Ligand binder design. Structure first.
Ligand SMILES: CC(C)[C@H]1C(=O)N[C@@H](CCCNC(=N)N)C(=O)NCC(=O)N[C@H](CC(=O)O)C(=O)N[C@H](Cc2ccccc2)C(=O)N1C
Lengths: 921, 480
């Protein structure tokens, strides 16, 4: 968020020149122009007879991004005697270390080789060139009469380089004293004063330097990296130096007093060959007056996820706590073979609202191993051990790794932003980059609704247009902005929403009165330095009249900054502070009835009853249902009565029950009826409604289980007792039989009839007599099988009464006679009663199948009136009623365990025979 | 009663035998013709069709040659035998199976590769006999433990650049030891000398022909030699199957990564092979020393066990280095080669081997192995035991279940443990045929010119034909 990772300035040098190996800032006190310093230790120079003698380029900012060599010298080697040069300046690595302070530039060539005045030789004493204005001079403290490797020969002086406060150079030669390394410190004034080009062992009077230690300290490379800070309290910059090979290659960092080079404190690494000390930096990262030391171990190996080691690197931060005591944390790397900790560049105040910050580099990590850098901000407790930003390389290896971040330098403001910018070296591509730091805008926010906890809507506000009176609550929100850097006085912004839960597809609820919308946005200008600026809004509350929408309601907003309009004239753009959230919300809640508790216990009861308690299923039965419910708790807020229904209105007819609206549906196969008591249902307001369902044909099934349960708004399961109705499976089984006769009566004598010896035709016997019997179901119950019988008078006084010929059948039934029908094989005076109880009986026995509502079975019989029995002398003038009867009963029903009923109905029909032509008196 | 044999149909002896091995074919008049010839064995035995007229094959798994597995690898007493039986004959049926055992023993010695890096800086001139004796006994004692050995050669001094080497007088540039009034060779870097070869005498006698150089700073650049010996497989000649060991010699401290900054060498090591046509490490003066993590990665990636042979004065430093190189060990480079030969023996004692079975020439018609491994784990399913050692035994079992009858009678298939000089083959052979119709009598006049198949004594007539010789017609056959 801090550093600009877009459009960073790039500087390029000659191919293979290692341009960018060492970097720094140039700060002339003579003029206001700022310059970068970049070292190219392998650049070919215009010197006579020198091959890649090194270079240092003053890279401007900014006309054309040009990098110009600094003419430290314009001469090749020099002669001690003819054909006996004292100096070998090819492959000397001039620019391996560059450092500046005010008008002074100090650059060194660690690999400059000279021939000792005492012998013919080539020793890399290393040499430095110091510029102070146009007065360039050469500083070579290791070139001396201490000649061999045992002394300052191979000193490689200028390998590591830094100034101090006031003016006193610190120089580190890792090669001195058989690579023990050493530090040398001198006054810049004395370095300039004692220079004459004709002396090769110049001595400086106020020099402080370390000295030969025991041989056991050889190959320690003391001075591999150096830094200065005050750690004793005298107010003079003390010397801190990295010793990457010390203590059996564990690595040590030495601290030396800045006024007499006495040893103050010693640090030790913990992992062999990690190179603990490859880079060091002294900074106070917690706001104190005391300076803390940082140390790099790029090759640190720690146990990984799978339990195996892995070179990730780390940085160890030792805070300084006013007594000489140090409390040390550690900061491990994040990638394998990235060498995290190669460079440590103090920035300071990069988090302008805070304490000193530090950057740490891993030049062989990132994508494609193009290099990466980590930014860590400091806090009063110490360092923010989680990275705050990421920068990584943007070029391909040619042919060596780009090594982005191999060397860096911060703590300088080139573009006058007010806080340090950062320079990154990528010498593998012969490039170095400049990263500018962005200005931080800090915004604090808050929104309030003092009418919070609205209880009654209080509809008073005029709805726009229609002028309807509606409810409301006041909503307002404010912000305040500040920033330490140079950023415009015209900061610009653009939103606020009426709900957070409803964002998932749901009903609309409230709206902003004049906006008619659930959310809004409107731009404003803040000016970067004022008190909270804001205004309030008017909300059209909704709803309980059309949306049944009283869980709480949330108010929420965020602020829309735009960086484009606030961009700095130099091309940069401001940024918002990292940890200030864009989200802010206040919800409270809304109250209508229930008591002052979070549960508002919905203790309630429901009961049901059935109008007809035995079902009688034979049709769309009038079945009716009665329900009631009551409230004993704080109240039901969503008192929806749900009722399940079998596979199977009207009740509004009367005011017998407390009727109220219901509904029905079968969503997801859950057949149900929905009836509402209230939203909320008023406390202590019990009710009773009633209900009706009414064809069913399932066999041996009694699964009707109407039940109740009431819904509410309570947060817990609020399951009310599930009371259900009851009905028994029973059916009525009414059945009856009826019949008719034709003719009903007859008058004798029969027309043109006379006695017979033996009859064979119908008219020989007499007129035809026919009876019809009809059986039909009456009750809902349907039987499986049934039987019926006919009773017929056959003979009386040894004479035939009625002579049956045949019978016909309609419907599901069959018949058979108990005596031979048509035995003679005929070709097809008050009333006295005859029948099976007096006359000889004839019976027809019949079986029947299933009958049902409206279904019938009919039996027909045809017979002849035996005229002889009533026309013979002894029977003349007689009258008889030859009636017949029928009866039936059920024998089986389609169920066994269910209730059963029988029948006893019967019917008789008339048939009268009389004499019409009677003798005269 | 036959549940299968007769109910699937009967046409001929060959088709009858095409049914599962539960069935047989009868060809005699010893019983009434109440059922076809393919009645099940339970019916065959009791109804008892003539013994001489029963076609009932039985699969035969018989050793063709089984030379027992040798318990010694010495050539003076054996040619070694690693898998048995070498060949088993198998008589088979198109739907039958039979057990077939097989056994394996690791007898031949494990192949080893010992490469030997030399420290040839002037520091070593005081105890060069130590390193030479070590190089000699590395070969001589390993020939006393394994007969499959290959040894190589290499040397390292330091990067031929300042401040490591004397560039100052032209005399020093070709004789660094000039300043001491003594002669020594110019500095190498790292140069491969002798590729891995089995000729002990050449390496043993050619070790003595190397001599020292001189550099300035006490640390020596041996890690470059480690990295190049590991990653230059061609020049070194590492062998894929062999156990790889790398012995590294040094008397002084070591240049670790990032020490090349003093010489202007700021390119990280990359682990590629850079040994040139002249057998010199071309990038010696262009690439920094390698990192311990990179060395460990490349050392495990190519299965190398590294043994530090260092003097008494740096044992602790390299031990502490060892723990950062997981799996590495270290020993004293004393005058006597002890304590580094022990590490070599110990390394040999831990190279366990695998016994995997592969098959070739196997037709599609024929089982997956069930492997019995060491410690008497008789696990089904698994077919490749691991963690075996010379002198141990592992047993496998398989049965030759059949899927059908192939085009012709004779086939074979070969089994071979992977990497073993031994193998076995089975001359699998399938008896799908029948001897009844081989007599060429069928379709003669005795079968009414082909109205029936001759059962080697009686003609099996087709539909509409009847009689022992098919001399009668079923349509015309009537009671009389
Ligand atoms: C004691 C001396 C005989 C010994 C030695 O190690 N001297 C030290 C300096 C100690 C003082 N340090 C200071 N800061 N004042 C030293 O120079 N170390 C580096 C080196 O010499 N490296 C070379 C590499 C090489 O050429 O192989 C090598 O090993 N030098 C000789 C080796 C030797 C000496 C005597 C007999 C056989 C071999 C060495 O060890 N020293 C000079």
């Amino acid at each position: 968020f801090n550093l600009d990772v877009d459009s960073p300035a790039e500087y390029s040098g000659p191919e293979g020149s290692y341009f960018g190996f060492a970097v720094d800032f140039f700060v002339p006190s003579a003029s206001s122009r700022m310059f970068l310093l970049v070292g190219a230790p392998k650049a070919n120079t215009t010197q006579p007879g020198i091959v890649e003698g090194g270079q240092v380029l003053k890279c401007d900012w900014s006309s054309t991004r040009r990098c110009q060599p600094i003419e430290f010298d314009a001469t090749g080697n020099r002669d001690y005697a003819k054909d006996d040069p004292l100096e070998f300046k090819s492959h000397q690595w001039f620019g391996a270390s560059v450092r500046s302070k005010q008008d002074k530039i100090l650059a060194c060539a660690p690999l400059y080789h000279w021939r000792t005045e005492m012998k013919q030789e080539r020793e890399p004493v290393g040499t430095c060139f110091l510029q102070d204005g146009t007065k360039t001079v050469e500083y070579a403290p290791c070139r001396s009469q201490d000649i061999d490797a045992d002394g300052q020969g191979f000193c490689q002086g200028g390998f590591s380089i830094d100034f101090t406060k006031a003016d006193r150079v610190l120089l580190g030669g890792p090669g001195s004293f058989y690579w023990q390394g050493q530090l040398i410190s001198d006054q810049v004034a004395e370095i300039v004063s004692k220079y004459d080009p004709n002396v090769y062992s110049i001595k400086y009077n106020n020099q402080l330097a370390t000295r030969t230690a025991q041989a056991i300290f050889d190959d320690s490379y003391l001075g591999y990296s150096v830094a200065v800070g005050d750690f004793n309290g005298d107010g003079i910059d003390d010397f801190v130096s990295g010793v990457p090979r010390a203590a059996r290659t564990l690595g040590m960092v030495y601290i030396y007093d800045g006024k007499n080079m006495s040893s103050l404190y010693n640090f030790t690494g913990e992992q062999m060959a990690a190179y603990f000390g490859f880079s060091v930096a002294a900074t106070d990262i917690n706001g104190d007056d005391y300076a803390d030391v940082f140390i790099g171990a790029p090759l640190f190996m720690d146990r990984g996820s799978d339990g195996k080691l892995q070179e990730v690197g780390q940085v160890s931060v030792s805070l300084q706590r006013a007594s000489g005591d140090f409390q040390t944390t550690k900061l491990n790397g994040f990638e394998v073979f990235a060498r995290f900790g190669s460079a440590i560049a103090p920035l300071g105040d990069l988090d302008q609202d805070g304490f000193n910050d530090i950057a740490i580099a891993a030049p062989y990590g990132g994508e494609d191993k193009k290099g990466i850098v980590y930014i860590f901000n400091g806090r009063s407790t110490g360092l923010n051990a989680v990275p705050s930003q990421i920068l990584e390389g943007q070029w391909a290896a040619r042919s060596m790794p780009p090594s982005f971040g191999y060397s860096m330098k911060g703590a300088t403001d080139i573009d006058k932003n007010g806080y340090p910018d950062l320079i990154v070296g990528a010498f593998g591509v012969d490039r170095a980059i400049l990263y500018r730091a962005r200005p931080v805008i800090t915004v604090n926010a808050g929104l309030e609704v003092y009418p919070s906890i609205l209880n009654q809507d209080n509809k008073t506000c005029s709805l726009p247009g229609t002028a309807l009176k509606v409810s409301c609550f006041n909503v307002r929100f404010c912000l305040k902005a500040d920033g330490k850097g140079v950023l415009p006085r015209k900061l610009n912004f653009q939103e606020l929403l009426l709900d957070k839960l409803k964002q998932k597809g749901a009903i609309r609820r409230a709206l902003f009165l004049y906006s008619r919308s659930p959310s809004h946005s409107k731009n404003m200008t803040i000016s970067r330095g004022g008190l909270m600026q804001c205004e309030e809004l008017i909300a059209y509350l909704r709803d309980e009249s059309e949306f049944r929408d009283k869980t709480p309601i949330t108010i929420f907003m965020e602020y829309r900054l735009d960086y484009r309009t606030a961009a700095d004239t130099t091309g940069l753009q401001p940024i918002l502070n990292q940890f200030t959230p864009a989200n802010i919300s206040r919800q409270a809640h809304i109250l209508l009835d229930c008591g002052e508790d979070n549960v508002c216990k919905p203790k309630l009861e429901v009961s049901v009853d059935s109008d007809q308690k035995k079902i009688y299923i034979g049709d769309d039965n009038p079945l009716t249902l009665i329900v009631k419910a009551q409230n004993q708790g704080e109240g039901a807020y969503e008192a929806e009565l749900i009722v399940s229904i079998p596979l199977q209105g009207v009740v509004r007819n009367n005011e017998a029950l407390a009727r109220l609206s219901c509904a029905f549906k079968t969503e997801n196969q859950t057949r149900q009826v929905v009836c509402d008591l209230g939203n909320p249902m008023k406390a202590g307001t019990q009710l009773l409604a009633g209900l009706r369902f009414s064809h069913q044909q399932s066999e041996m099934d009694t699964s009707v289980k109407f039940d109740l349960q009431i819904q509410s708004s309570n947060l817990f399961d609020k399951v009310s007792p599930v009371v259900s109705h009851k009905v028994d499976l029973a059916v009525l089984a009414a059945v009856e039989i009826r019949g008719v006769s034709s003719p009903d009566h007859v008058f004798l004598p029969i027309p043109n009839w006379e006695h017979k010896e033996n009859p064979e035709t119908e008219e020989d016997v007499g007129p035809v007599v026919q009876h019809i019997y009809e059986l039909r179901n009456n009750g809902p119950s349907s039987f499986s099988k049934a039987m019926l019988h006919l009773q017929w008078p056959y003979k009386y006084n040894n004479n035939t009464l009625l002579y049956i010929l045949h019978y016909d059948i309609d419907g599901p039934m069959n018949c058979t006679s108990d005596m031979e029908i048509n035995p003679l094989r005929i070709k097809i005076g008050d009333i006295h009663t005859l029948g099976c109880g007096v006359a000889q009986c004839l019976k027809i026995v019949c079986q029947v199948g299933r009958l049902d509502r409206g279904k019938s079975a009919i039996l027909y019989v045809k017979s002849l009136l035996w005229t002889e029995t009533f026309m013979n002398k002894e029977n003349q003038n007689h009258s008889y009623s030859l009636k017949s009867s029928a009866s039936f009963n059920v024998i089986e029903f389609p169920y066994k365990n269910l209730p059963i009923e029988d029948i006893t109905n019967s019917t008789l029909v008339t048939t009268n025979v009389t004499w019409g032509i009677q003798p005269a008196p | 009663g036959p549940n299968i044999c007769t109910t699937r149909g009967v046409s001929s002896c060959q088709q009858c035998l095409a049914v599962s091995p539960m069935c047989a074919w009868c060809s005699d008049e010893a019983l009434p013709l109440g059922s076809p010839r393919c009645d099940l064995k339970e019916n065959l035995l009791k109804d008892n069709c003539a013994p001489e007229s029963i076609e009932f094959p039985v699969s035969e798994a018989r050793v063709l040659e089984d030379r027992p597995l040798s318990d010694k690898g010495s050539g003076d007493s054996s040619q070694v035998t690693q898998v048995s039986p070498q060949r088993i004959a198998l008589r088979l049926r198109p739907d039958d199976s039979k057990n077939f055992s097989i056994q394996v023993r690791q007898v031949e010695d494990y192949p080893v590769d010992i490469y030997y890096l030399m420290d040839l800086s002037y520091s070593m001139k005081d105890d060069l006999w130590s390193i030479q004796n070590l190089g000699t006994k590395l070969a001589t004692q390993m020939r006393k433990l394994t007969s499959n050995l290959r040894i190589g050669f290499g040397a390292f001094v330091d990067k031929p650049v300042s401040p490591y080497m004397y560039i100052s007088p032209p005399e020093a540039l070709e004789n660094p030891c000039y300043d001491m009034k003594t002669t020594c060779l110019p500095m190498f870097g790292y140069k491969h000398v002798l590729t891995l070869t089995d000729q002990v005498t050449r390496f043993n006698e050619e070790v003595k022909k190397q001599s020292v150089s001189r550099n300035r700073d006490a640390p020596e650049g041996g890690f470059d030699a480690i990295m190049q010996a590991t990653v230059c497989d061609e020049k070194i000649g590492w062998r894929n199957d062999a156990s790889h060991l790398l012995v590294f010699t040094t008397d002084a401290k070591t240049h670790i990564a990032l020490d090349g900054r003093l010489a202007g060498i700021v390119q990280p090591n990359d682990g590629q092979c850079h040994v040139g046509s002249d057998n010199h490490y071309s990038a010696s003066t262009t690439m920094d020393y390698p990192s311990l993590g990179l060395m460990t990665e490349k050392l495990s990636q190519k299965n190398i066990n590294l043994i530090f042979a260092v003097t008494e004065n740096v044992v602790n430093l390299y031990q502490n280095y060892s723990e950062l190189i997981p799996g590495t060990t270290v020993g004293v480079l004393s005058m006597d080669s002890s304590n580094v030969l022990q590490l070599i023996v110990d390394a040999y004692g831990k190279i366990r081997s695998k016994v995997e079975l592969e098959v070739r020439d196997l037709p599609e018609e024929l089982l997956s192995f069930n492997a019995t491994c060491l410690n008497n784990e008789v696990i089904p399913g698994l077919k490749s035991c691991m963690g075996l050692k010379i002198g141990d035994t592992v047993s496998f079992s398989i049965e030759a279940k059949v899927r059908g009858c192939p085009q012709e009678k004779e086939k074979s298939f070969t089994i071979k443990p992977v990497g073993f000089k031994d193998s076995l083959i089975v001359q699998v052979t399938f008896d799908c045929d029948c001897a009844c119709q081989a007599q060429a009598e069928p379709n003669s006049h005795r079968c009414n010119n082909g109205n029936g198949t001759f059962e080697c004594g009686v003609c099996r007539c087709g539909p509409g034909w009847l009689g022992s010789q098919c001399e009668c017609s079923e349509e015309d056959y009537r009671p009389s």
